[PDB]
Design a protein around this ligand. Structure first.
Ligand code: NAG
Ligand code: NAG
Lengths: 108, 108
């Protein structure tokens, strides 16, 4: 079986300023494939690769390979701000690609 | 010194269908920081992380840490197609971030 993303994954969310929000990507049959979290933006921002956050460890947290099956990948956006509004995706390096996207709406 | 991107890096380019095109990111003072190449799209696509292409090794090639200074990172897009049009960025996990973007125009 190829990797698939179990649903619900990457559910859209809303938040007030300062609230913490999680996006969860649950991957079935990941095997040796890699998971990356990205924010859609111009330019986009890599947020995590495999088991490590790319940068800003106090802003983004990644709990990779958790859950009962070691197959839940939870990205936390801490202290949400207006600049965090937008679309977050988790993507797996399959051919063809496998991905799931959800929106963060920020209320002031 | 923090990482910086030497200019010219990530120069815009044009191509006919089937042509190969390179984007080069030349990083001064990279240290232990990581380089990622991303395509802006909805959703964006991670193309490479550190020294390895994310996926589609026959489509994207990465020559990481080449040049005289071992500080040129060259991403090749092989066999350019209409779907390859858009903005390619290299980004380094500094705080704050360091990045450079160039456009690929595809002619039919
Ligand atoms: C996120 O993507 C949806 C399409 O799935 C789009 O309608 C929405 O505007 C995007 N959110 C942004 C750009 O903040
Ligand atoms: C790439 O980004 C530039 C802004 O720097 C924008 O004008 C252009 O439309 C983009 N190219 C696309 C979306 O193909």
């Amino acid at each position: 079986a190829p990797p698939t993303i179990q649903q619900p994954s990457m559910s859209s969310a809303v938040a007030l300023l300062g609230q913490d929000v999680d996006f969860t990507c649950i991957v079935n049959d990941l095997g040796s494939h890699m998971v990356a979290f990205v924010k859609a933006d111009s330019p986009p921002r890599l947020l995590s690769f495999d088991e490590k956050v790319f940068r800003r460890r106090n802003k983004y947290e990644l709990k990779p390979r958790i859950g009962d099956l070691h197959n839940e990948w939870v990205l936390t956006i801490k202290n949400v701000q207006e600049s965090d509004r937008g679309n977050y995706s988790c993507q797996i390096n399959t051919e063809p690609i496998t991905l799931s996207t959800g929106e963060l709406d920020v209320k002031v």
